[PDB]
A paper describes a structure:
TMEM120A/B were originally identified as nuclear membrane localized protein that plays an important role in adipocyte differentiation. The cryo-EM maps of TMEM120A and TMEM120B reveal a shared homo-dimeric assembly, which is about 80 Å in height and 85 Å in width.
The transmembrane domain (TMD) of each protomer contains six transmembrane helices, designated H1—H6, enclosing a large solvent-accessible cytosol-facing cavity. In addition, a short amphipathic helix H0 parallel to the inner membrane was identified between C2 and H1, flanked by two intracellular linkers L1 and L2. Near the extracellular side, Val159 and Phe166 on H2, Leu208 on H3, and Trp305 on H6 from the two protomers contribute to the interface interaction. In addition, Arg178 on H2 of one protomer forms hydrogen bonds with the carbonyl oxygens of Leu111 and Val112 on H0′ of the other protomer. An extra density was observed in the cavity, the size and shape of which is reminiscent of the 3′-phoshoadenosine group of acyl-CoA. Nevertheless, the similarity of the overall fold, cytosol-facing positively charged pocket, and a potential bound molecule in the cavity imply TMEM120A may be an enzyme in lipid metabolism that catalyzes a different reaction from ELOVL7. Therefore, based on our experimental results, TMEM120A could mediate conducting currents in a bilayer system, but does not behave as an MSC in heterologous system.
Author numbering:
A (entry chain B), B (entry chain A): 8 to 243, 268 to 338
Write the structure that this text describes.
């Protein structure tokens, strides 16, 4: 009849009463960590202030002073390295205030993961998502370049590209906030490629389009290729670059050649648009920045291998 | 000389030693909450299972049974309401697994705020951001519609729109995951408006453009207006709709009129594109869904006021 419902009801009564006891404990513990994070904020304060203070002290110690002062400054520098090391390792496990871009998108929400295992899991996903879409990019680009020629599909492709680049901005900005710091060219890169595909999204199907489309689609396929085989090197060290560097240089030069083709094509036919210049410029800037940063980084690693 | 540096160094030594003691305590407490959330998850399990079980029990009790069984089922339904109330109030303070869209963008990161004050602060920001951009939208749209007529600026405007709608998708999806549930038409709305501005981003500056542009820009200005004065009603209750409903209906009908203008304009001139149809359809679907949902909601509130 219904006595079974009555019995399971009676049981679940004290069950969820104990559950609510655990829940009160859990709420107390959530306010407890919150007040402990308030507390550590003072540790953050000392972290900045007294560090930078000893920094300026050593900075004012550079003048010529007795042997005692040079020896002391030596000891200070030999300790401050591990000092900042300790303090950064400390701060790494504290939820951090969002930056500017991530704030303007996600509002004011905390995203820090405060758990090394979580950081590894997150980066593994950040790589798998990159790979899967790099595959769908190669496929769609090649199909649009060979199997048919229709402006609608170029529009769809350029929309996929701008979406992909914006999503990578969001992802790698959480990653920057959360863990390692890749601050440098590899953000403006995405910022200058999305605007590129933008200004290419509005070509008025003239003749310049039928003279630039093939170069652009081939280059997109090949750049997607180098990103497709950039994953493997990240996963599995120095001997790897020995095969990657020729491909990276071939890519930089392919893109440089496209930029020149564009910046030149705007000089002979009956007319043109503004888009020829406004789309050739991104490419040149991409080449300059990318070549510059890659060579500087490989020189830094070469100099580290030197010593 | 340097003795001051030595003194402040000596002090900061035990200072940050105590800091590290607090830090060890804090780490222990973070693993403590983590294991407590593992625990409460069993509470989640019972929450789903035994609830739905008593649900199916009451469902099987609908048949005609003695007075004891109808009275008992009455007591069960009179308790289950507050039962689910308790259990949802409980679950509301548990970090939740991300959905589908937010997962495909932000990876696998937890965003729940687990603090009522945080929810209020977040929604207040979600409203202020909406307002500020609704202002910049009105301004730019009106300027593009009157002060000059140039296709570049229409492109910029449509890009601003698609960006804005995607950002609102992200924001309000974090909001859905975090607190109240607005599941319904007010997500596909943004999903069908971004694609609208998309398919309008690629008009080949024919004549159809010079016959549709004025209608579209006026309607954008007015829809931005109704969003600009939707904030105030949300902030400061039933007497408010008494003035808003005429504006909402005027807007729905303005958009219906644009959809008809488009779906018709594709029948007389020398030629057209596919964009006329692929852009008139969104508008019709917007009108249908929006009118439908608004009227259904106002009828629901009218029926709640009835009883």
């Amino acid at each position: 009849p219904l006595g079974d419902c009555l019995r399971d009801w009676e049981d679940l009564q004290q069950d969820f009463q104990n559950i609510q006891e655990t829940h009160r404990l859990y709420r107390l513990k959530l306010e407890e960590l919150t007040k402990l994070q308030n507390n550590c904020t003072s540790s953050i304060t000392r972290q900045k202030k007294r560090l930078q203070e000893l920094a300026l002290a050593l900075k004012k110690c550079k003048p010529s002073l007795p042997a005692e002062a040079e020896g002391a400054a030596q000891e200070l520098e030999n300790q401050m390295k591990e000092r900042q090391g300790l303090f950064f390792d400390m701060e790494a496990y504290l939820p951090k205030k969002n930056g500017l871009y991530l704030s303007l998108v996600l509002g004011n929400v905390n995203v820090t993961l405060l758990s090394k295992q979580a950081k590894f899991a997150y980066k593994d996903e950040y790589e798998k998502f990159k790979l899967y879409l790099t595959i769908i990019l190669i496929l769609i680009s090649f199909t649009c370049r060979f199997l048919l020629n229709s402006r609608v599909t170029d529009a769809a492709f350029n929309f996929l590209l701008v979406w992909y680049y914006c999503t990578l901005t969001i992802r790698e900005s959480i990653l920057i906030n959360n863990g390692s710091r890749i601050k440098g060219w590899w953000v403006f890169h995405h910022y200058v490629s999305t605007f590129l595909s933008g200004v290419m999204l509005t070509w008025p199907d003239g003749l310049m389009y039928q003279k630039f489309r093939n170069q652009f689609l081939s280059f997109s396929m090949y750049q997607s290729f180098v990103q497709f085989l950039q994953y493997y090197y990240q996963s599995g060290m120095w001997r790897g670059l020995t095969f990657l560097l020729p491909f990276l240089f071939f890519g930089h030069f392919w893109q440089l050649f496209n930029a020149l083709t564009l910046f030149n094509l705007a000089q002979d036919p009956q007319c043109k648009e503004w888009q020829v210049l406004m789309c050739g410029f991104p490419f040149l800037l991409l080449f300059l920045g990318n070549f510059f940063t890659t060579l500087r980084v490989v020189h830094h690693k070469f100099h580290s291998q030197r010593h």
